[model samples]
Target chain A: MAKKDIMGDKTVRVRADLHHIIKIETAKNGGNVKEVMDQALEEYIRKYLPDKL
Target chain B: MAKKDIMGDKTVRVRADLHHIIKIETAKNGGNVKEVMDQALEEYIRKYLPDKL
Candidate 1:
């Protein structure tokens, strides 16, 4: 059981507008763009995980 | 004459485990993680864009 979920960069080309809104999600976190991207991505799989099965 | 709809390198830190799953989705693109990341974020934005107030 690994406690440390070592994170790494996954670069992608996204819509400027889309990324702009997602950047707002980090109002409290303040400038950790990667964190927001991670949350969005994690949520993405949650919604589509069934399709993979 | 106006074409600001550009793309940028969004290199964000993602969960290693989650990254593992995304790689499988791009089995044909020769392990193109960015493509999926692009789609995943794009889909995520569209899915929730209407609900946001």
Candidate 2:
């Protein structure tokens, strides 16, 4: 069974299809996939997640 | 079959054991695991990867 994911401290396995477009786009732009993913995730958390719950 | 990973532009599965020591050390230092990981990765890219491909 998959374990419960904490609100912000969790690891969730994502589908490759979700990642494929970003991966291809970044690589084509000469950017590192890991770097772009990290940046994007940080932004998403900072921009969207509630500061306190 | 596993897909081939491109140099400087790919995601390769790394064993957690590979990061075990650093992970434990950083967490022991009162650092957020995610923050530590992100900082370490950014520093690695800045310090080691070629500036121009």
Best by TM-score: 1
Clashing pairs in 1: none
Candidate that would win on lDDT: 1
Tens digits of per-residue lDDT for model 1, A1-53: 14335755668888877765554444322455677776777788889895642
lDDT of 1 at B4: 30
In candidate 2, stretches whose alpha carbon ends up further than 4 angstroms from where it belongs are A1-12, A50-53, B1-53
* A10 Cα displacement, candidate 1 (Å): 25
Model 2: native contacts recovered, as a fraction? 0.00
State the displacement of the C-alpha of residue B17, model 1, in Å, after optimal TM-score superposition.
0.7
lDDT of 1 by residue, B1-53 (tens): 24435645858999977875654444322446787788788788889884652
What TM-score does chain B get in every candidate? 0.63, 0.43
Q: Write the per-residue lDDT of candidate 2 for residues A8-52, one digit (tens) a residue.
A: 344456577766665555434446446666677878888888583
> Can you give the lDDT of residue B8 in candidate 2?
37
Error of 2 at B31 (Å): 38
